[PDB]
Structure formats: structure tokens, C-alpha cells
Ligand binder design. Structure first.
Ligand SMILES: O=C(O)c1ccccc1NC[C@@H](O)[C@H](O)[C@H](O)COP(=O)(O)O
Length: 259
């Protein structure tokens, strides 16, 4: 039919309205204080940085965590994460803006709102729920849109994870002087995965640009090999797909449990 990300944005627009009508910016605007946490800093260092994600379901795998509970998840993700990602999209990943606060309190790491942001309202909306940073996608926006949204987040003391999926987007994120570039291994059109994208698009990125490899990381071996190309990883399913969540972090992130 058509790209999956395409369908998603359609619904994201129809979603903000059904909520902009309900909870307009004015009904909370000048009441959202900047973020008292630093996303950008949290990902700095020579040590592999981890962005653990709380996700319940996805277009690619359906329902992942049959028994979701953003409370118990952050209770574990907090002992290891550099940052914690939270899908705030209900229709596709069964996420919810309320999960953000639920975590920002149980976990001290900067919270990242993982959603398809196409409206400044959304940024204002997440900051309201304690979202310490947001995700802007160069495959869903264009320079002007990005600058706009980029400026907005940088107003509320919020970090910006810039997602690139190809060389053109990479070159763009560079021209835009993006500070944290997330390279997505998943082709959001057909939902196919290729970890070489990380290998391909990171070498050029130069310093003062933290590279985060996102999606498809299933094993520790992959973490270890790809740590040669990226500064960090954003891992969702490899963790959410297991009941014993702590044992999962040991296997996948620490190459523990002796495999
Ligand atoms: O994961 C999906 O199936 C999907 C589908 C369409 C659009 C975006 C998608 N992923 C959202 C994205 O934020 C992913 O959750 C993270 O990059 C982590 O993925 P994971 O480690 O779970 O493979």
C-alpha cells in the first residue's frame, strides 16, 4: 500500500487536533517550567551510553509486553540507563503522555518522549508531563520545520534526538548542526531492518555530535560490534519482550548471564 510511517503521521495530525481541541496550549502553556535534567550531557563520554525504552507494542511486532507497567520498568531501567525513552503514541505503540511523569519520578535519568513530533504543541505538551527531551525526525520534517521545532524544545530546556535514515538525511542533520543524531536501523516504510545503516551513516558525523544507534539491537554481540560506530544505543524490544526485565538487561546490555 504505502509507507507505514506515512499512515502514522496522518493519524498523528488527526490526534493532536482531537487533543488540541481538548487540552489547548493556553490551558497549561506558561505553566511548564524548563527541563531540570540534561539529556545532551547524559549521553556524553567515551563509555557506551544506553537509552532504554518503555514500549508496549509496535507496528512491527504487535503487542510486546503483554503485562505493561511503566512503574516496574523504570524501577529497573534506572540502575543502568543514561536516558529513558517513552513512546507517548497510543494508536501504534499503546503509549501515553501520562507514562512520562510516571517514569520521571521513579527514574532520575533524563526522560525522552518518543513520538512523531510534527507540532510545537506536542513539544509543549510533553514538557508539561516532564519530558526532558524529544525526538525530531528529518524524514517527517524539512529544515524550516526542524529549526522551528528545534528552537521550541531549546526554549524549554529540552534535548533533541535527531533521527536520520539515509545519507541525505545525515548530511541534513549535519547542515542543521544537530547535536545528537539517532541513526534508525529500521526502514519505517516496510519496517525492514539493516544495522549497516549505523555503520554507514556514523563515520562522517564528527565530534560534538553524539551518535545513537536505534532499533534492531537484539544481542550483546551486536551491541559490542556496533559500539565501534555509535556512542550509544536505544533498545526497546530486546528488553520489553522479557518478563524478568533485570535478567534481560544483564544478557543484552552486559553480555552477562554468560549469554
Ligand atoms: O518499532 C517499530 O515497529 C516502529 C514502527 C514504525 C515507526 C517507528 C517504530 N519504532 C519506534 C522507535 O522509537 C523504536 O521503538 C526504537 O528505535 C527501539 O526499537 P527496538 O529496540 O525495540 O527495535
Amino acid at each position: 500500500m504505502q509507507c507505514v510511517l506515512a499512515k502514522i503521521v496522518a493519524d498523528k495530525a488527526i490526534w493532536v487536533e482531537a487533543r488540541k481541541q481538548q487540552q489547548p496550549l493556553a490551558s497549561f502553556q506558561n505553566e511548564v517550567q524548563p527541563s531540570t535534567r540534561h539529556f545532551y550531557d547524559a549521553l556524553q563520554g567515551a563509555r557506551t551510553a544506553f537509552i532504554l525504552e518503555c514500549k508496549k507494542a509496535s507496528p512491527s511486532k504487535g503487542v510486546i509486553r503483554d503485562d505493561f507497567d511503566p512503574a516496574r520498568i523504570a524501577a529497573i531501567y534506572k540502575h543502568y540507563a543514561s536516558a529513558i525513552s517513552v513512546l507517548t503514541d497510543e494508536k501504534y505503540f499503546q503509549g501515553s503522555f501520562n507514562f512520562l511523569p510516571i517514569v520521571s519520578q521513579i527514574a532520575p535519568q533524563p526522560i525522552l518522549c518518543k513520538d512523531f513530533i510534527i507540532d510545537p504543541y506536542q513539544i509543549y505538551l510533553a514538557r508539561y508531563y516532564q519530558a526532558d527531551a524529544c525526538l525530531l525526525m528529518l524524514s517527517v520534517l524539512d529544515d524550516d520545520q526542524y529549526r522551528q521545532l528545534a528552537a521550541v524544545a531549546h526554549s524549554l530546556e529540552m534535548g533533541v534526538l535527531t533521527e536520520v535514515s539515509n545519507e541525505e538525511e545525515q548530511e541534513r542533520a549535519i547542515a542543521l548542526g544537530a547535536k545528537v543524531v539517532g541513526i534508525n536501523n529500521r526502514d519505517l516504510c516496510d519496517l525492514s531492518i539493516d544495522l549497516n545503516r549505523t555503520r554507514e551513516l556514523a563515520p562522517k558525523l564528527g565530534h560534538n555530535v553524539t551518535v545513537i544507534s536505534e532499533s534492531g539491537i537484539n544481542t550483546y554481540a551486536q551491541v559490542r560490534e556496533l559500539s565501534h560506530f555509535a556512542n550509544g544505543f536505544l533498545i526497546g524490544s530486546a528488553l520489553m519482550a522479557h518478563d524478568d526485565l533485570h535478567a534481560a538487561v544483564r544478557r543484552v546490555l552486559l553480555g552477562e548471564n554468560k549469554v
